[PDB]
Amino acid sequence: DERRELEKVARKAIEAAREGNTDEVREQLQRALEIARESGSEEAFKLALEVVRRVAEVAARAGNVEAVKEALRVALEIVKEAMELIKDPEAIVRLALEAVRVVAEVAARAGAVEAVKVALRVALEIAKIAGTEEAVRLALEVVKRVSDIAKKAGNEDAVKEAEEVRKKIEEES
Amino acid sequence: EDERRELEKVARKAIEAAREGNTDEVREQLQRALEIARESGSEEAFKLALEVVRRVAEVAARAGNVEAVKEALRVALEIVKEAMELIKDPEAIVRLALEAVRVVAEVAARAGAVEAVKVALRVALEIAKIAGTEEAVRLALEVVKRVSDIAKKAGNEDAVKEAEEVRKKIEEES
């Protein structure tokens, strides 16, 4: 039922991401967050994270930093709601950090410093909200992946950015 | 030849400065690549120089150095200007340069470097202006259209509006 509503949102969200329609991407992800927030079930959040993951992936490979920010903002909102309502939110936290990882690697290889900063920032805030050893572990690996890709490509700014985020995740723990 | 190895030694210095962000050493090396091609006078030296330019611009873009990307784009224009004066059939040089400006603009747009995308569009226009052939105009419009569709997917209204103005001037200055 609400699975059908999200699947209709997924079609419109992905299509706007392929063409670069940042306004439609923003409103579809907003609708997807509302469907999961009204349902309140764990499956509704995971289905909404799947739409977020695919949109953020296309937006990152297209270089649309705005659509990346909106996707990762909704992904963070889903983690926030899951940490208050879902009994075992560790699966939702895994899905969100995986979506952040793909954005981070795509931006790091292309050299999109701004998209790297956002992905590293979101990984930092997801680890702070969850506060679990698994969330910190996955967040640091996202930072480690960006650092390795950036050092190989000689992107000093992305290396320095991953430097600061790694320390801030450590101090949060 | 020996010039193929002299250009490769210049590309090594130009790539290192592109990784480091030393935009002044990138420009100096690319000028030496232009001078090595100028003293040769053969179209194969100009083609190898364009490949040095293309390879340097991509490394600089992935390294997060937009100024080294823009200086590399400007050298590709000077290579066309030098090839127009010497080579009998510079159509192969112009085609390789316009496709090099295209691939660099695509990497620049996917990296969020809006200004490097603007410079690439301005270089495509000047290449069509200098080449003066109807083939080069068609190929320059194809580069601007490709960059426009890439910028549209990147959600960059600035580059789309800039490609719209460039595409108009290329049609007029023909």
Author numbering:
A (entry chain B): 3 to 175
B (entry chain A): 2 to 175
Task: Quote the original article.
We set out to design proteins that can switch between two well-defined and fully structured conformations. We reasoned that these goals could be collectively achieved with a “hinge”-like design in which two rigid domains move relative to each other while remaining individually folded. The hinge amplifies small local structural and chemical changes to achieve large global changes while the chemical environment for most residues remains similar throughout the conformational change, avoiding the need for global unfolding. Designing one of the resulting conformations to bind to a target effector couples the conformational equilibrium with target binding.
The backbone conformation of the DHR serves as the first conformational state of our hinge protein (“state X”). We solved crystal structures for two designs, cs207 and cs074. For design cs207, crystals were obtained from two separate crystallization screens: one screen for the hinge alone, and one screen for the hinge in complex with the target peptide. In the absence of peptide the experimental structure agrees well with the state X design model, and the structure of the hinge-peptide complex agrees well with the state Y design model. The crystal structures of hinge cs207 in both designed states demonstrate the accuracy with which two very different conformational states of the same protein can now be designed.
